[PDB]
Amino acid sequence: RTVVRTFDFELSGYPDETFRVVLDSVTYELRFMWNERDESWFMSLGDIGAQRPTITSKLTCYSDILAPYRYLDNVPDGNLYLWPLGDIRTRAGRFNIGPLKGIQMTYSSLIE
Amino acid sequence: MRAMERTYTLVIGRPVVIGEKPVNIEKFANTSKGDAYEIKDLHIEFNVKKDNSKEPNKGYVTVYNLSDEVVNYLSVNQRESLAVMLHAGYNGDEKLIFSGTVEYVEDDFPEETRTTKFILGDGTLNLTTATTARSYRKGTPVNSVLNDLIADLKLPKGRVIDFGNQTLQTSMAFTGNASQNLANLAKNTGSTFSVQDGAVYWTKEGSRFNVMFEISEEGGMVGTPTPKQPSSSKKLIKAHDIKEDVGMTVSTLLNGAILPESTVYLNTRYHKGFYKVAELTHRGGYETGDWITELGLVETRGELI
Amino acid sequence: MRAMERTYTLVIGRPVVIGEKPVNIEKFANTSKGDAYEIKDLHIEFNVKKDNSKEPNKGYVTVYNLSDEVVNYLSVNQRESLAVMLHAGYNGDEKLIFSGTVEYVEDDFPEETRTTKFILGDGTLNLTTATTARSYRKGTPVNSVLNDLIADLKLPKGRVIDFGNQTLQTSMAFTGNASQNLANLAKNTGSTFSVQDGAVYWTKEGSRFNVMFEISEEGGMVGTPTPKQPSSSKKLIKAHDIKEDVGMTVSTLLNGAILPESTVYLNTRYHKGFYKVAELTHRGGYETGDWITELGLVETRGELI
Amino acid sequence: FNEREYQLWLLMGSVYYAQTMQGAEGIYLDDLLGKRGIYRLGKTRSTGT
Amino acid sequence: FNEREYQLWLLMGSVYYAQTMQGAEGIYLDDLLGKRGIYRLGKTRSTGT
Amino acid sequence: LRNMVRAVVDENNQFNFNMLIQGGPN
Amino acid sequence: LRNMVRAVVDENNQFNFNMLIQGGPN
Amino acid sequence: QFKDLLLDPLTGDLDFGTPGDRGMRLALTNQLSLRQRLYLRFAIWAGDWYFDETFGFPYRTFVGKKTVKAVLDGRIKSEVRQEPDVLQITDFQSTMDVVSRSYKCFFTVVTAEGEEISLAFVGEDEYQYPTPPESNVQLCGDEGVIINFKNKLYYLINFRLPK
Amino acid sequence: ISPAQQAQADKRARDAAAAKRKQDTEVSNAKSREDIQYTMFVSGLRRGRLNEFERKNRTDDLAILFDSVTTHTYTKDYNKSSYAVESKAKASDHVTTQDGKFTFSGTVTDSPYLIDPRNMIDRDTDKENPMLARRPAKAIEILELIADSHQLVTLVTEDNILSNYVITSFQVDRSSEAGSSINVQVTLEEFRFRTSDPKKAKNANTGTKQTAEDGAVDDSAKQKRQTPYIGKNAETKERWENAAIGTTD
Amino acid sequence: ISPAQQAQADKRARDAAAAKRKQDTEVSNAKSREDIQYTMFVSGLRRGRLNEFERKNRTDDLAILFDSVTTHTYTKDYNKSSYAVESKASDHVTTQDGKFTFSGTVTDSPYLIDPRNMIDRDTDKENPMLARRPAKAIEILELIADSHQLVTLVTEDNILSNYVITSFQVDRSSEAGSSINVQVTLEEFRFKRTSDPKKAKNANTGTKQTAEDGAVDDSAKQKRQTPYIGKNAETKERWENAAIGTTD
Amino acid sequence: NEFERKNRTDDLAILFDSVTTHTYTKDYNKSSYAVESKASDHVTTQDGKFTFSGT
Structure with a gap:
């Protein structure tokens, strides 16, 4: 399953960010919510103007977020991962997500 | 003691999706978050013409100094047809004045003041894409043809x-x-x-x-x-x-x-x-x-249907 | 020490004649006398729109207080398509900004100031008169049809x-x-x-x-x-x-x-x-x-050709 | 106040039931067997000769 | 009264993901990957010549 | 002042509509 | 001052283009 | 919080450290960073650094010319406020001697201290991942549960008898 | 021209360019500090309003006092619509309120009487040698910084207190009539209208987002080089990213 | 930066935001009650206008008196066609709104402190300058103008009603210290529920949609249905669900 | 201090026999419509003017 890096993300730290992104020539809308007690980011994925999000999950490092969901016509077939740029023991935080902040959220697409 | 002052409200909802039943713009008002983006106390200029002909009724609107969040929500959905309703009246009530889809939207922000523009169409999407393929033979009652085409x-x-x-x-x-x-x-x-x-x-x-x-x-x-x-x-x-x-x-x-x-x-x-x-x-x-309406009247000479 | 001041140049050449080879407006710049009629230090107003569509790009120009000789040279050739080039920049260089044929020309001289008008077309003559008559059979490679029509x-x-x-x-x-x-x-x-x-x-x-x-x-x-x-x-x-x-x-x-x-x-x-x-x-x-240019950008979603 | 509190108990019961094998439905089924490291298949293609 | 149930909802949401391929942390992570026979490594001593 | 301009634009539109639609039995 | 007039003429042209080109599947 | 290589306040060379811990260090505390940011800003004469003609201080304007003390103080006091994290300037004793033609001023600057936002790029981690158990303790229990109970009993027997 | 003249030409570019950098960077520093507020005491200082002048600490709350304020005025305006009726008369419809405008005139003298250090103008002024302290000059570079940075000023007048006012223009006249002082006039108008707790935050929007410009994939678009890794924990990363992420090729 | 400043920027935002809640709230309630009627007495008083000044109470018919009024002017305007008429065609004329303006002053050393004046609601009898009367007048003046009250003017000759304030000016010049000069401008207003059914007339409200956040509008906004308070859950329950159903 | 820097070939200087008055002024403008709320970007800076009289 050859895959190539094709997109990177950044977060400003606002607890209720929402924006639209284009992946594999298809367009999706994303929502990020910050959880206080669990100090983690909650990601919701869905179609543009959809009544409810298609997928909701909790973000973690080195875990394949989309693994159990590559069976729907509206879910990207690529790979979405979070891995750190600094010390390997650093876990995902609020302000430490970005191309140079410490954690590299990235999307990669299979070659077809 | 008060004066007699104007009031209005403008609402923006979800994208309109045509299906297999009559379209009602009312049910699309609510956004995914629930309550819609309502704009009340901002200087607004609008012009809405209506007629009885094939073409839909179209209305124009302009809003000054909108917040960046609202403009962002319209930068997205630029491929889609957001539902919009407009209300106006005098400080005690507001009557529905237009309802349709956002055909066009553009933003110009030269120095001091941003000015958003809209062009709205009353049922433009349905009137310009509803295909048909029907036929009838000699003797068919015309009253049946009319109902078939409208549905x-x-x-x-x-x-x-x-x-x-x-x-x-x-x-x-x-x-x-x-x-x-x-x-x-x-x-x-x-x-x-x-x-x-x-x-x-x-x-x-x-x-x-x-x-x-x-x-x-x-x-x-x-x-x-x-x-x-x-x-x-x-x-x-x-x-x-x-x-x-x-x-x-x-x-x-x-x-x-x-x-x-x-x-x-x-x-x-x-x-x-x-x-x-x-x-x-x-x-x-x-x-x-102005805050007025203009009516073009036509004399009648037929029966009182 | 200087300021940053505008500069421009406008050139008028021989009539354009279409032949049996690709047309280049460059080679028509020189007039029968040799050097062309160049206009540098006269107040000029112009508007040039460009696009990617069937229609040619057209630009408008206005010049005030032209000498009688130049106007006479345009009173003649009113049946013909004179080649024109326009240059603009900032006091150190001038980039080609338009090149085409003079579609229209008129002069109004009420009392104090004459005002010449132009309408220029980018390849209007070729795009509106190049006839063709071609045919192909099933199995022909489409890449061959494209090259045949462009030539x-x-x-x-x-x-x-x-x-x-x-x-x-x-x-x-x-x-x-x-x-x-x-x-x-x-x-x-x-x-x-x-x-x-x-x-x-x-x-x-x-x-x-x-x-x-x-x-x-x-x-x-x-x-x-x-x-x-x-x-x-x-x-x-x-x-x-x-x-x-x-x-x-x-x-x-x-x-x-x-x-x-x-x-x-x-x-x-x-x-x-x-x-x-x-x-x-x-x-x-x-x-x-103004001395500015306006660009309308469009988002892309395809491959990086 | 009790009605608002009662929903909390109902939510907890639903979460427990949603994660049991018997009550696994739809996406929730995918998550449970996903925990085992396997995922449902997708659009499959024919093979001929 | 209301702000407290916000904490309860957040904690409940945290609990649900504890039994999924993603979101597991700490002790709960071991149980998920324990099903596949992998255990964390403890303190280690450097070796060399 | 835009009131003055809108009136002239409206009159020109009226003239063009008249030019397109004129005479005819239908 | 011609700046003010050009803007109104441009807006009217925009409205006419919209009237001609609207809706449609093509 | 601007990070950069640490400059020794005493010598001007890089602060390689004491002979017992020689190495290289980064300026972490805002105080140290601001000190060198002002030092370099004042030490480089205007226009003398290639790749940036606008950086530095224009000493040539004043040195060697008959100048007014008040004008110089304004420029000295202005260059300081170009840093975005300067709160205020407390005092300023500008004095000039005409015999030796020397000029010497004193002043201090106040700056606050900030947080580190993220430790990912610096050294350590703040979490406390658990330790795997040892031997058959997990499947059969632990002896410490007995030791702690025995100690509690012993201390309770100690408490009741007056001492 | 001559090779020596090239050096002279270079001086123009540097000194002229360096001048705007000092002005531009200083303005950029403003609009970045949000914990700073500016207040102007037009009048009332000696009658009741002394209570507010004591609350300012010369560090984040700053006071602007003037050696003399000749006059100040306040004028609010409203707009009234009117439509015609068939009775050959005119009626009225809703009305609107047009913000509000404030202006005042003052003077800063090069021979002050009341040198109060709490005033932010007198931060560095010498107590015993005032005329050489350049008070008239010292006020221009501080007044101009406030205006060109678009600060929201608060005015403490004897009659009332005004907030959310933005400066629109000002003048400085060194006429020969007075000398040793500057005549100052100012005008203002009412500009009538991340961090923080997740509880208080609501759903925001950002619109369409392209690839981040601070990391890879932009270099492939900008045709640049990918940044090499720093080696640490090698043979553990490379096996995983190369298999799970791949390379942009 | 440092957290010490974040605890300072909040103070700057909090106190500034509190100002609107004070000023913006006062105008809201001032427009939410139409019983109060403001009046102004420009001159007139001592020439028998006292007959109606005594009618003013301290709760509904508030009255305002200035320490001195220097000049007041009244004017009306008309316009006519500038082209020769076709001939009688006397309808080629229109009436504009009449304007009224005057100048006054409020001083720290009043000579008459009649308590009936609303400026002197709670002014001290023996220390007028500590009462800060000029500040009292401005606070009153802005509220009347902001709420768009239909003011009534009592003048020397005639009485004017339905006049709104369009502009006013205040200044404190070096001369005439301890006082403020005030100018006002007013224009006519051609103005044209719990009501007696006998006075009711057929009205209209246009097309209407689902009204207010109800049991059905909540579903549209994805809000959860409001739980029913169990005052009684035996009678309605069997009938409510069978006849009305549930939004779903 | 800086007048003496001026030579007679590159940095030419001009002095008038007398200057009576000189004035300096700057201008700014803002939107005249209520903003949507902080939206402090609704302001622009004009070019400063300088004038004087001499003899």
Whole structure:
């Protein structure tokens, strides 16, 4: 399953960010919510103007977020991962997500 | 003690999606978050014309100094048709004045003030994409053809006047946009077809419906009525006779509870009588400008349907 | 120490004559006397729009207080198409900004000041008279049809993206103006065809070409970018997907080294990314007025051709 | 106040039931067997000769 | 009264993901990957020549 | 002042509509 | 001052283009 | 919080450290960073650094010319406020001697201290991942549960008897 | 021209360019500090309003006092619409309120009487040698910084207190009539209208987002080089990213 | 930066935001009650206008008196066609709104402190300058103008009603210290529920949609249905669900 | 201090026999419509003017 890096993300730290992104020539809308007690980011994925999000999950490092969901016509077939740029023991935080902040959220697409 | 001051509200909802049942813009008001983006206290300029013809009713709007979040929400959905409703009145109530889809949107922000622009269409999407393919044989009742084509258009039936026991004289075939075919049936049967604020209206030319509205100095009239020809050209005449051919003009303070196909009574000191409505134009400047409506009336000579 | 002041030059040459080879407006600059009529230090107002479509790019110009000799030279040749070039820049260099033929010319001299008018067309004569008569059978490679039709148009090939191993599915026949036939092949194959400053450009919709231009406060930007829809109407969608449908707007100081089919990089504080170009408008007032250019950008979603 | 509190108990019961094998439905089924490291298949293609 | 149930909802949401391929942390992570026979490594001593 | 301009634009539109639609038995 | 007039003429042209080109599947 | 290589306040060379812990260090505390940011800003004469003609201080304007003390103090006091994290300037004793033609001023600057936002790029981690158990303790229990109970019993027997 | 003249030409570019950098960077520093507020005491200082002048600490709350304020004025305006009726008369419709405008005139003298250090103008002024302290000059570079940074000023007048006012223009006249002082006039108008707790935050929007410009994938678009890794924990990363992420090729 | 400043920027935002809640709230309630009627007495008083000044109470018919009024002017305007009429065609004329303006002053050393004046609601009898009368007048003046009250003017000759304030000016020049000069401008207003059914007239409200956040509008916004308070859950329950159903 | 820097070939200087008055002024503008709310970007800076009279 050859895959190539094709997109990177950044977060400003606002607890209720929402924006639209284009992946594999298809367009999706994303929502990020910050959880206080669990100090983690909650990601919701869905179609543009959809009544409810298609997928909701909790973000973690080195875990394949989309693994159990590559069976729907509206879910990207690529790979979405979070891995750190600094010390390997650093876990995902609020302000430490970005191309140079410490954690590299990235999307990669299979070659077809 | 207060003054008599204007008020309005503007709402933006989810993208409109056409399905297999009549479309109601009402149910799309709520956004995924729930409550919609309401804009009340910002200077707004708008112009909304309405008519009884094939073309949809279109209205223009301008808003100054919008927050970045709202503009961002419209930068997205630029591929989609957001539902919008507009309300206006006088400090105690607001009547629905337009409802449709955002056909166009653009932003210019030179130095001091941003100015958003809109172009809205009343059922533009349905009237310009509803295809049909129907046929009938000699002897078919015309009343059946009319109902069959309207159901294809997928819009609520505001009001219809059936043909009775009329029957087709020759075989007929219909294709292309349903609206165009219906507008052709209008010419050959003396009927008026026009969609407005989502409602389908099918009536007969020359005839009119009670005094649903009365115009007088108490009713906020603005200036005396003046006679104006209802068309920019004159037709040759034998001098169907029942058709229109005359009209008048009046202006009044903004009042959204009026429609092109309604009937009005004109209680002035010079002119008195009953008239049909043929055209509407709503104008508005919140901080500065008029807040009035203009009606183009047409004389009637048919039966009182 | 100096200031940063504008400069320009306008040249008028021999009548354009179409022959049996590609037309180059460059070689017609010289007049029978040799050097052409150059106009430098006279107040000039011009507007030049450019686009990527069938229609040619047209620009308007106005000049005040021309000498009688020059006006006489244009009173003659009123039956002919004089070649004209325009240059603009900032006191150190001038970039080609338009080249075409004088479609129209008129003079009004009321009392104090004469005002000459021009309307220029970018390849109007070729695009509107190049007839064709061609046919092909089932199995013909589409890449051969494209090259055959362009050679008929008699213009230099600015850039073309061949179809590969595509083959015709049905027999085809082409007549009438070659430009019209090519513009029809665009719809059915997702390709953009448009002539500009004498160059033929054939590309594919959705895809884009490096950062050939970067926009930033250092690059003489004027105001922040704003999102504007690239068309005055909205299309129904299934919600080819690759097609356009989004865009933005930017303004910059006059810079003639830009073309509709190019690619630009937008380095601002809010918006960042790559965009295609879709429309250009060059404005200019020598003594008084703007000296800027406006770009209409469109988002891309295809491969990086 | 009790009605608002009662929903908390109902939510807890639903969460427990949603994660048991018997009550696994739809996406929730995918998550449970996903925990085992296997995922449902997708659009499959024919093979001929 | 209301702000407290916000904490309860957040904690409940945290609990649900504890039994999924993603979101597991700390002790709960071991149970998920314990099903596949992998255990964390403890303190280690450097070796060399 | 835009009031003055809108009136002239409206009149020009009226003239164009008249030019397109004139005479005829239909 | 011609700047003010050009803007109104441009807006009217925009409205006419919208009126001609609207809706449609093509 | 601007990070950069640490400059020794005493010598001007890089602060390689004491002979017991020689190495390289980064300026972490805002005080140290601001000190060197002012030092370099004042030490480089205007226009003398290539790759940036606008950086530095224009000493040539004043030195060697008959100048007014008040004008110099304004420029000295202005260059300081170009840093975005300067709160205020407390005192300023500008004095000039005409015999030796020397000029010497004193002043201090106040700056606050910030947080580190993220430790990912610096050294350590703040979490306390658990330790795997040892031997058959997990499947059969632990002896410490007995030791702690025995100690509690012993201490309770100690408490009741007066002492 | 001559090779020596090239050096002279270079001086123009540097010194002229360096001048705007000092002005531009200083303005950029403003609009970045949000914990700073500016207040102007037009009048009332000696009558009741002394209570507010004591609350300012010379560090984040700053006071602007003037050696003399000749006059100040306050004028609010409203707009009234009117439509015509068939009775050959005119009626009225809703009305609107047009913000509000404030102006005042003052003077800063090069021979002050009341040198109060709490005033932010007198931060560095010498107590015993005032005329050489350049008070008139010292006020221009501080007044101009406030205006060109678009600060929201608060005015403490004897009659009332105004907030959310933005300066629009000002003047400085060294006429020969007075000398040793500057005549100052100012005008203002009412500009009538991340961090923080997740509880108080609501759903925001950002619109369409392209690839981040601070990391890879932009270099492939900008045609640049990918940044090499720093080696640490090699043979553990490379096996995983190369298999799970791949390379942009 | 440092957290110490974040605890300072909040103070700057909090106190500034509190100002609107004070000023913006007062105008809201001032417009939410139409019973109060403001009046102004420019001159007139001592020439028998006292007959109606005594009618003013301290709760509904508030009255305002200035320490001195220097000049007041009243004017009306008309316009006519500038082209020769066709001939009688006397309808070629229109009436504009009449304007009224005057200048006054409020001083720290009043000579008459009649308590009936609303400026002197709670002014000290023996220390007028500590009462800060000029500040009292401005606070009153802005509220009347902001709420758009229809003011009534009592003048020397005639009485004017339905006049709104369009502009006023205040200044404290070097001369005439301890006082403020005030100018005002007013224009006519051609103005044209719980009501007696006998006076009711047929009205209209246009097209209407689902009203307010109800049991059905909540579903549209995805809000959860409001739980029913169990005052009684035996009678309605069997009938409510069977006849009305549930939004779903 | 800086007048003496001026030579007679590159940095030419001009002095008037007398200057009576000189004035310096700057201008700014803001939107005249209520903002949507902080939206402090609704302001622009004009070019400063300088004038004087001499003899």
